[model samples]
Structures are given as structure tokens and as C-alpha cells.
Target chain A: TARMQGAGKALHELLLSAQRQGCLTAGVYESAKVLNVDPDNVTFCVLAADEEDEGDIALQIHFTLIQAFCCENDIDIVRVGDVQRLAAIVDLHCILISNPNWKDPALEKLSLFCEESRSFNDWVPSITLPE
Target chain B: RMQGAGKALHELLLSAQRQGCLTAGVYESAKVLNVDPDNVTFCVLAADEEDEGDIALQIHFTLIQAFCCENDIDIVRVGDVQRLAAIVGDLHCILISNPKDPALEKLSLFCEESRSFNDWVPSITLPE
Candidate 1:
């Protein structure tokens, strides 16, 4: 039902768009803090669940908690397939998609993608505003 | 004036807690609406601010609306569900207050005045 996207390219475009719009937060700790402070404001989130990150059971638990929080807040969060690429995309260990302006087409596309195809077990982020 | 509802609802629920004159959650609200109409003064339905959908109950809302009309109880809508839950100390809560409780008049009055303005917060009247 949805067109597939080349993974890293899509991530790059989404991250760059967020950067341009000044509506993104990066890194796991910062993203987590922002999400907790105002879960309502956070539209989407990305949790990098790489093999090593998941290998650390403690870290995996932390990521699990974030996932639960996102679900409860109605924030669409994805586990990215390529952690290194995601880090390179935004130069951060994690990413948060928040407050995308209505005019940002990239974010809109990203939001649609996240909402429709939320099946990935890797890392990605998106935010869909109410219609 | 776009006054915030989170804090106001918080204060109102705290007062209700002190007076022990509040019914919370869908079950209790339904009971009071049916069994004790005269006891209800105002109602605050949780308007989910998140777009995740499937949070609010339309049947419950419509049912509450009819009860409020027949009972002359004021109805308010609030989207600040987290703070409201904290105030009521319940995970699943829809606050219904008794007019006899302390500060319910203030809550009722806010919803009353909120009937006028488009962006009025702290409260908004349920539409017919």
C-alpha cells in the first residue's frame, strides 16, 4: 500500500528537513529529556536499537521504556535499521522529530511514512499533525 | 482569553479531593449521570490532545450531554489529561463535580463565561 524508500536517503532527507525547520532534537539523552518534559510537544521519536545497543540488556530496557512512553503519547517512533547511517545522517546517536511546521513537505512525507508503515524494527522518526 | 485548563482543572480536582465530592472515570460518571443527576454540578471530559485517536468515548459524551441538559449541569472539555489524572490521582479519570463542593462554582463559572469566547480556555461549554 506504500512505496518503498531507499532507507538512508529517506532518513537523511527527513533529518535535514527537520534541521532546516529547527524542529528536531538529537541524541538519546536529549531526546528523552525533551520527550519527558513535554510528551505532548514531541510528535515523533527515533530509537537506535543497534545490535550492540540491544546487546546491552540495560540499554534495551531504556529503549523499551521510551517506546512505551511514545506509544502512550501517540508519538510514532521507529527502530532504525542502520544505526551508523542514522548517526551519520544527523551526527547523533538518536533523533527526535518535533514541531514540524505545516509548510515542511519533507516532514509531512515522513509523517505519512511513519504512520502508514510503522512495521520496521529499526530506527526512524516521524510526526503527524491532526487533520 | 485563552486561559489554561491544566492548572485550573488540577486545582478543581484537588478541591474535590479535599471535599470527597467527585466522581471519576467513565463508570462513575455514567452512574452519577443516571442515578444521581441532581448531585452533579459540572463535568470535565478528557479531550485527548494527542492525535492518536481512540481515546474519548462518543457514546459516553452524548450520554453525558443529554444528562447535563436535563439536569442543568455545566459541561466542560479539557485536553490536559495528564495533569487532570495527577490531580484526581487516577490513571483513567473523567472528573465530575458536585456543585455543593468547594470551588465547583469557580469551575462552573469558568465554563459559563467560556461559553462566549472562541479561544477561551480554563474551560469550554459542551456544544448542543
Candidate 2:
């Protein structure tokens, strides 16, 4: 499937900067919990697409929930197409972008990349930042 | 009333049976969690044993949290497979719906109000 590619690149960059900032959380469990504990601070959420066909309904259930929660709270969510390559970015399958410093120089650039790259696509939903 | 996974699964099963809305097993629970059918009151994940092969169990519970959060459903943890099997007939996980009913509310409140619900297992709400 020709899926969304830009978000992967965008997250590749976002997670990289987040790692330096110490704001990235990996795996589905921790990420979902963070939203509840600190919704106001949660900046972004990313669910990697299935590569090995290993994702069961149970796995996607959490992603679907994150999608709805983000929608109500104005957090950005994107499904990266390439799980293998995306995992290579942070050595984890899922990542949560929390408490981003919008004023930080690197973060500003990364956000800009995400903003410009994410467009309404059929395969992957786009990102939405708070107004 | 309110209890640990061993007994809680029994309560959940009875409540689910009364409501006529329950989904069990990893595959089925995933669909219910993903789709998040309206009136879903709660969710339960059975993962007493955490092993390398059970990575999916972690992922399933985590995602179940997402579904609960999005749909305003509650979720809890259970470890007693034998107990769950006795009530629901069998399961790795389950989703129970039909919200706001006093029965569901009681269980929901029990989860939310408990100070220490099997501290070993994670609850639908915050950990004590």
C-alpha cells in the first residue's frame, strides 16, 4: 500500500529532537497513560503502521483510542507507514511527543516540518496542533 | 461487589451477561476496543504472566486504555484465567458495554474509588 510517508520522516526528525529534550515515551502502554496523566502537556502521539502483519485488533484498539483522545484534546496523531524504518529512528515501535518546547529552536523547525508535510491523505490521517 | 481479578472477572462476567454485551479474547476485544461500540461501560485485560511471548498482552492493555479514554469507557486488569474461564467460558481479555447502568456504575466506581485494587495488577483508572 502507498501509505503516508511524510509523517514518518517528520516523526523521524521529531523523535530525534524529543530524545535530546527527554520528552519521548516509547511503547503503547506508557504513551496512552501519559495522555491521561498529563493531557495538557502531551504534544503529539504516533502509532507505527504494521510491517510484519503482527498487529492484531488488540494492538490497533489502543491506536484507535489514542486517535479519539487526541481529537478531543488537540493532540497530534499520525500513523507512520514504515514500521521497520520508523523503529530504527528511536529503537521503538511507538513514540509519544510530550511537552514540546515550541519556542526551542530545534523544536520549532521540527514542528514546521510536521506542519508542512502533513496533509489530508487517505492512507494516514494528518496532524493537528492546538490553536 | 468489588474484588481482585479472581473475583472481579466473575462480577464482570455476571454484569456482562446481564447487559448482553461482552467481547472476549484478544482478537475480539481488540475489535470492540478499536471500534469502541457505543454504550461500552468497561474493558478488562488478563495478563497475570508477563513473559517475552506475552508482549502482545502489554500492547493489548495499553491500546485498550486508548479505546477507553477515547470512548469514555473504563478498563481494569485481571490475572485469574481459570476464574474468567468459569464465568465467561474462557478469555485472554474482554470488553463489556452498556454504560451508566447502576450495575456497571457500581463496578466502575469500585475501580475508581479503590485505594488498593490488587496492587500487583493495573486498574482502569490511576494506580493507588
Candidate 3:
């Protein structure tokens, strides 16, 4: 569980760092555009939703579609419950980490987390962030 | 006036370009429209006077227009290829994929006004 929490914090910091560097694309539409034009450039995809969004079937459908696309393109996909926090960082429920050349230590850790999750057949891994 | 709409659209294009959210060129824009049509906020198709007789180009434009109409994306035809080129380089089409922006709101209002006047697929001439 500590590992999961650490992974979550790493993701949060990675998003903030990526935002500062303009290496992140925010919003469902914007992320979809990036995926369509250059899927290879995207290293990660995040779908954020909280308890307040439980009744939003449309958002769920969007998450489903993006998950499918990410799987087909061999991109790491994750789901987070902190939609409000995500909005504070990127102003969107969905985001794509682009610019493959931009490297970070967190990316390697997250990639391993994703790989371990997949080993257990968990396609879309969930991560809990620190409050 | 369509001129006002043209100026507003041009301004939106410039802002989107500056923000790095504008997708230029027919091939790339087409890919975006096909994959994520609902997320596309605006579409622009440019044609100069010389392109009127280009049947293949016209067919491509026609299909793009049909798709935009079906997807409810606000689209406009601009008569100046050079003017469109100035914003994001030479291109027959451009897509503004960002869903939320002040400039997008301005263009959306213009589209609403044009539609109220029964002007579908409003054609605008960018100012020199």
C-alpha cells in the first residue's frame, strides 16, 4: 500500500512538472487530439473522476474509450479518484503526458507500477493520492 | 457582419496557435475529426479563388463539411488561403481542439448569431 501511495504522489508531481514544461495536454478533447495525431509521443494517460461524478455516464464512456485507445496503442493508462486535485493541476478530467524526450525518475517508477499491475491482469490500475 | 465573424475567427486562430492547441493541415485535421469529432470546437476550411475548379479538393472539402455538420462542430469557410496560412502556416483546413477558451467562446457566439440569420456554413473574407 505504501508503494501504491508513493506511485500516486509521483504521478501528481509528474503532472505538475509536465505542466510547467508544457509537456502535458489537458482536457478530454485535447488529449484525444494528441493521441490521434501522435500516439507514439504519449507516454501516459490519466483519467480522473471522484465520487461526485459517479452518475456521469458520459464521462465513464469517455474514460472507457480512452482506455481502449491506450491499450491498443501500448500506452500506460491509470485511473485516479482525485478529479478536483487533477483540475487544480491541469484543469481537466483527462490528461496525456506527451513529449517522449522529457524524462523523469517518476516515469520509470510509474512504468514499473503499470507493468506489475499488468502482470496481475489489471489493465487500468488505480492509484490513491495523499491528501 | 461576416467581416466581424472573420476577424473574430482569425483572432481565435491566432490565440489557439499561440497556445499550441491548433491543428493545421487537411490530413492532420481529418485524423482529429475522425477520431475525436465531439472534442473539436471549431473547424476552418480555406480556399482561394483558384481552387474553385479543383474537383478533388472540392470533394474533400464537401466531405469535411458534412462530417462537421453531423458532429455539431462550428465550421466556417474562409476565402483567403494566404490569410489562413498566416496564422498556422499553409493549410486547407485547421481544427481547434481545445474545448475551453475565451476565443472559442467568441467564435461560438458568432456561429450562433450566423445560424439565427439562416446562414449555415457562413463564408467569410478575412480582412487585409
Candidate 4:
């Protein structure tokens, strides 16, 4: 559905957020790799950031994810709030979605939203990849 | 009538029961007049605890502007095992129809988000 796709577009932007942040810099160039590292596969990772708890990154991911979930016509508020906890862990946020293991389209939908948030402030993610 | 998921689910359940089933029951194009369906919309997933999950349902109504507690109403959760067990009865697959385009109203801003939002299945290949 176009609405779901809109969610996808939103999520795609979420991942772009991480790239902008340079938090998930490694997977920037390859969409296959981005898909590989997304939460769809329950993927997570680590970056040069020195934060030990690494909870902020997780929150950043959740905030972006919620936006995508908000876009869907089928979802309700409680469900969206509850789903955020799954994404709470820094470990999960690291890989999120990685290579050939897309769960259900639901995961993709949420993942897409998470990817979209980087641009919430603007299309420009905090991090920038090499040209 | 919907206070939360259970309440909201009931609203959809009623609508689904009245309208029949489809591939995406949550996205059902039908409406139950007078009562705003916007009060119920959500997506409960396995990851969410025993019963909670994603929710885009607005808490405030546009016309009402009152905090009437809206439901995000995503049927995707109906397909999930954890969420369905808690609510009403078995929910089979159901096709959801596309929403009619209200391109002239303030909703027109939303049009960019949904160029073809007013029909069933927004043809995955079409450009937005």
C-alpha cells in the first residue's frame, strides 16, 4: 500500500539520519548493507562514540522509528509505544537490519521510519559519508 | 467507546464484523458514522510486551481538539500471535481499501505523502 510505502520512505530517511550522525557510518554506501544492518534482522553495532551506556543512540533510533510507525493507517498508539522497547537496546540498534533476513514487512516498516528520522530536524543527517 | 487497545480493537472488530474480511482488515475503507474511527488505530507487535506496541493514533481530534484518545489502528498487529490472543477472536487476513483523496482540504498537505491514497493497494511500483 502507498501508505505503507510512505512509511518506508520515512524509515529510509531514518537510516539516513544515522548516516548523517556518523553513528552507523559503515553501512552508508550500500543499500544492501543498510538493509543488512537494519533492525529487520535484529541487527546492532558500535561506532567511535565514547558513550558507555549508549542509551542515547537507542533513543534516537526509537524517536525516528515512531515517526514511521505514525505514518501507517493500520497502527494504534499503544502498539507503537510498546514496540519502541524492542528497539531500546543499543545492541539491537547497532545492526538493526542486516542482509537477507527481513522479518515481516512490519519490521521493514518500522525500520524505514527509524532510518527517516535523521532528517527530522532536516534532510541533513548529523554525519556525512565520503563522496 | 475505546479507552485503549481493547476498546479500540473492539471498534475495528465491530467494523470488520459489519463489513466482512479482507487481506488487510486494519486498513478497512469503511466507516461507522457519527463515531470517529480516528479514535482507534494502532500496531501491536511480538516485541512489545504481552500486549503493547507501536501506535500512531492521535490523542487529540481535529474537530473536537479535545484529548479524546485516538487509535492508530494498524491491522498489522492482528496478524501477530501475541497481540491477537489478548483481544477478541481469531482475525483472518483481510484486504484494506485505499483512502479517498481529499486533495482540496488541509489534508492536501498530506497528499504529498499519499498521491494515490484513495484506493486499494497503492501499486508498489508507482512513483510518489
Candidate 4 has what TM-score? 0.21
lDDT agreement of model 2 with the native: 0.60
lDDT of 3 by residue, A15-123 (tens): 8888888888877756765786789999999988899777776557556667888999999999899877776656377889887476788887889989888888888
After superposing candidate 2 on the true structure, give the runs of residues whose Cα lies further than 4 Å from its correct spot. A1-9, A53-55, A100-131, B1-128
In terms of lDDT, the poorest run of 10 residues in model 2 chain B is B119-128
Instruction: Choose the strongest candidate by TM-score.
Output: 3
lDDT tens string, model 2, B1-128? 25443344466567677768786666556555545467566677765554325654566556556666666566666665555566665366677766335555566666665534543224432112
Clashes of 1: 4
> Which CAPRI quality tier does the interface of model 1 achieve?
incorrect
lDDT of each: 0.59, 0.60, 0.78, 0.30
> What is candidate 4's TM-score for chain B alone?
0.25
Tens digit of lDDT per residue, candidate 3, span B19-105? 777887665676577677877889988888898887545755776787898889999898888877775553788888773565677
What would you estimate as the lDDT of candidate 1? 0.59
Tens digit of per-residue lDDT, candidate 4, span A30-114? 2222432343432322221223434654334333443243333222111121123323321232232233422345445454544
lDDT of 4 by residue, B38-122 (tens): 4333222222233233332211011111111123233222334444434334122222222321211222232223433552111
User: Which runs of model 4 end up more than 4 angstroms from their true locations?
Assistant: A1-61, A64-97, A101-127, B1-12, B17-87, B90-128
- Model 1, A35-81: lDDT tens digits are 76788877667776556665765445446666777887878676665
Worst 10 residues of 1 chain A by lDDT: A122-131
